Every structure is written in structure tokens, then in C-alpha cells.
Design an enzyme around this catalytic site. Structure first.
Site: not given
Ligand SMILES: CSc1cccc(Sc2ccc3n[nH]c(=O)n3n2)c1
Ligand SMILES: *[C@@H]1O[C@H](CO)[C@@H](O)[C@H](O)[C@H]1NC(C)=O
Length: 344
Positions: A146, A244, A288
Site C-alpha cells: 500500500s 484494487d 488490497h
Molecule cells: C491519493 S493518490 C496516491 C498515489 C500514490 C500513493 C498514494 S498513498 C496510498 C494510497 C492508497 C492506499 N491504500 N492503503 C494505503 O496505505 N494507501 N496509501 C496515494
């Protein structure tokens, strides 16, 4: 409860609230393989939403309540039955307590309520592990799920540069990014704005070649795997569900024709971004994370499990290998068209 907590000896490298960051370690004396895993858990991007996170997600902003041990699960398990890939490796779990997608380089100070030191935490963990046996490593696999998976993409080449500069050019640094490969797509009904704001709030840092492409004010682009990946030099294996759940959440998806087409196009676009990623595992599932789940061995793409694909990747890093594939992307267009998808 096999991984033991070590708080950083350099106590100026801190979690959000100024408490020391740290890592959990299980050494394997007969192994020159080191797995450093970055935990995920979203992020916060201004005073008000970081204050909210501090109230109800404090373990992601502070070490004061961390337990002395954690159990390694999935790819962090030392049991061959649970971890066919790297069960005998030295195992490191790095808690995510910087809320900055592992990008920050900012201390708590008179002008900063919180410290955002994710990028420095990784570098300090590496430096302290070198005194604990990492100096003898042949492979350092920086993995993460994540926000930790995006953290791998942002930090793997910096770890490689750190070790080179410290005089360990023989340690092979590689990345395993799980569930951190997102699309800056149109929503079904502001993700990129939150990261742009976060980068300024955190003093966030991105890989140098990617920074040089996008330049000042556009570093947010480097948080998107398909844009930062081509700039990286370390081998990176990408694990990403085609549907996802976090991608769908930011897309405001929670089935009639409009949404059916939206979901199918998301899977198609994700698949397209992985077409030229030679080491990847991308099942057609709505889910996820995968790599630290105890049942991570169960999912297969084209009959090949992720532990197998990772083993094939290791062999490839010694022309394609007979029956040992490393590029595994589903082509079927709907969640759970792959029968091995997790049930939930
Ligand atoms: C909001 S655009 C984006 C792009 C790249 C990284 C991130 S950070 C993130 C995004 C989704 C998620 N699901 N669980 C978790 O820890 N994350 N972290 C955000
Ligand atoms: C501790 O970490 C900070 C931030 O990375 C660094 O500037 C400092 O030199 C470190 N201190 C020691 C003694 O290594």
C-alpha cells in the site's frame, strides 16, 4: 512473535510526534538475504487531518505504544509452508509512523507540529542494520504494501545509492512494490491534489531522475508507479490487483452499464501500464495488499503463484526461463474472473 523491536539509536530520526522510529528484526544467521518491509496505512497532509489521525491511528504516528515483538506473516514468515519464497531470510518490518508515503525529510520544530521523516527512517534503518549483519548481505529486497509499496518505488534507488556511497557495492538492492501502483485516472464521481499538498507539508523527496523529468511543483507525478518506475535502475517486481480496493475508493466507486464500463476500463488501463513491466503479478481481483497475508500463497495467475513468480525473478537475476514466469498479468476483464481471487 518472532520479530523483535529496535528503536533507532539515532533518536533524531522520529515518528510524526517526535518519538523514535524503529524496526522489528528477526535475524537468520545462515542467510545473506535481507527483506526490509515497509508498512502502509494512507497518509495525512495538513495540520487538521494529521491531528485527526493522531487521535485514532496513533500507532501510525508514534512509537510510544508499539509492542516489543511482532509475528512475521506471509513473506515475513520464517516457516516454509507459509513462505515458500524467502522463509530463511533475515526479516525486517519497518513500522510506518511518518504518514508521508515514506517520502518525508522534515523534523519537528518551532515551525512544524509533526515530523515527516519516512525517507530518513529507511536510510537510518539500513545504516543501523549494517552493524547487525547487513554488511554481509548479497541481496537486500526492499518490499512494502500500500503506502509502503509506493514507498518502495520512491526509495529503492536511494537505498542502492546509500549502500554504494557507504562502500558496499556488492549488495544487490531490489524492490517489491505491493498494492502501491495507482492511476491518476478520472473518478467515477482530490487524490493528486492531496499528494501535492502533502509533498509541501512533508518536505517530500522523490527519486532524482523522476524529479528531473517532472521538475519543481510536479513531483507528485513520481508517486504514480507507471511514471516513476521507468526512471528506476534497481530491479522492481510490481504486485498489483487489477481492481484494487484503494484505487476504487479514491475513484469514488463503492452494476449498471456506466459503472461496468468504468470498472472494465480501470482493469484495462492497469493492465496496459504493466505491459512493459517484466516482473509483475497482477490478478483480476477486487482486493488490497497480498504479500504479508498468511494465505498469500493461494492466488495464482495463469497457474503460477506469487511465491513462485518471486522465485523465478530471483533466478532471472542470477532470456526467459522454461516454466518459471515472472510477468503474470491477468487478461480477463472483471473482478474474480480469476477463480483463485481472495474470498474475503
Ligand atoms: C491519493 S493518490 C496516491 C498515489 C500514490 C500513493 C498514494 S498513498 C496510498 C494510497 C492508497 C492506499 N491504500 N492503503 C494505503 O496505505 N494507501 N496509501 C496515494
Ligand atoms: C541522525 O540523523 C540525522 C537525520 O538523518 C542526521 O542528520 C544526523 O547526522 C544523524 N546523527 C548521527 C550521530 O548519525
Amino acid at each position: 512473535e518472532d520479530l523483535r523491536l529496535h528503536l533507532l539509536l539515532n533518536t533524531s530520526v522520529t515518528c510524526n510526534d517526535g518519538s523514535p522510529a524503529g524496526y522489528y528484526l528477526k535475524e537468520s544467521r545462515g542467510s545473506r538475504r535481507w527483506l526490509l518491509f515497509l508498512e502502509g496505512g494512507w497518509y495525512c497532509f495538513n495540520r487538521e487531518n494529521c491531528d485527526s489521525r493522531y487521535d485514532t491511528m496513533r500507532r501510525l504516528m508514534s512509537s510510544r505504544d508499539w509492542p516489543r515483538t511482532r509475528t512475521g506473516t506471509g513473506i515475513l514468515s520464517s516457516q516454509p509452508e507459509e513462505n515458500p519464497y524467502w522463509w530463511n531470510a533475515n526479516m525486517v518490518f519497518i513500522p510506518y509512523c511518518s504518514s508521508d508515503v515514506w517520502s518525508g525529510a522534515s523534523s519537528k520544530s518551532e515551525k512544524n507540529e509533526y515530523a515527516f521523516m519516512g525517507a530518513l527512517i529507511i536510510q537510518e534503518v539500513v545504516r543501523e542494520l549494517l552493524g547487525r549483519g547487513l554488511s554481509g548481505a548479497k541481496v537486500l529486497l526492499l518490499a512494502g504494501s500500500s503506502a509502503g509499496g509506493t514507498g518502495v518505488l520512491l526509495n529503492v534507488d536511494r537505498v542502492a545509492e546509500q549502500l554504494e556511497k557507504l562502500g558496499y557495492p556488492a549488495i544487490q538492492v531490489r524492490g517489491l512494490a505491493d498494492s502501491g501502483w495507482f492511476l491518476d485516472n478520472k473518478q467515477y464521481r482530490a487524490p493528486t491534489e492531496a499528494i501535492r499538498r502533502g509533498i509541501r507539508y512533508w518536505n517530500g523527496v522523490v527519486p532524482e531522475r523522476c524529479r528531473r523529468q517532472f521538475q519543481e511543483g510536479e513531483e507528485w507525478n513520481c508517486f504514480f508507479g507507471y511514471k516513476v518506475y521507468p526512471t528506476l535502475r534497481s530491479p522492481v517486481f510490481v504486485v498489483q490487483w487489477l481492481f484494487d480496493e484503494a484505487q476504487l475508493t479514491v475513484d469514488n466507486v463503492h452494476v449498471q452499464e456506466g459503472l461496468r464500463l468504468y470498472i472494465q476500463n480501470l482493469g484495462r488501463e492497469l493492465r496496459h501500464t504493466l505491459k512493459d513491466v517484466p516482473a509483475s503479478f497482477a490478478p483480476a481481483c477486487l482486493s488490497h495488499e497480498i504479500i504479508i497475508r498468511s494465505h498469500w500463497t493461494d492466488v495464482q495467475v495463469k497457474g503460477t503463484s506469487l511465491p513462485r513468480a518471486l522465485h523465478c525473478w530471483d533466478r532471472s537475476l542470477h532470456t526467459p526461463l522454461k516454466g518459471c514466469p515472472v510477468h503474470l498479468v491477468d487478461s480477463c476483464p472483471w473482478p474474480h474472473c480469476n477463480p483463485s481471487c481472495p474470498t474475503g
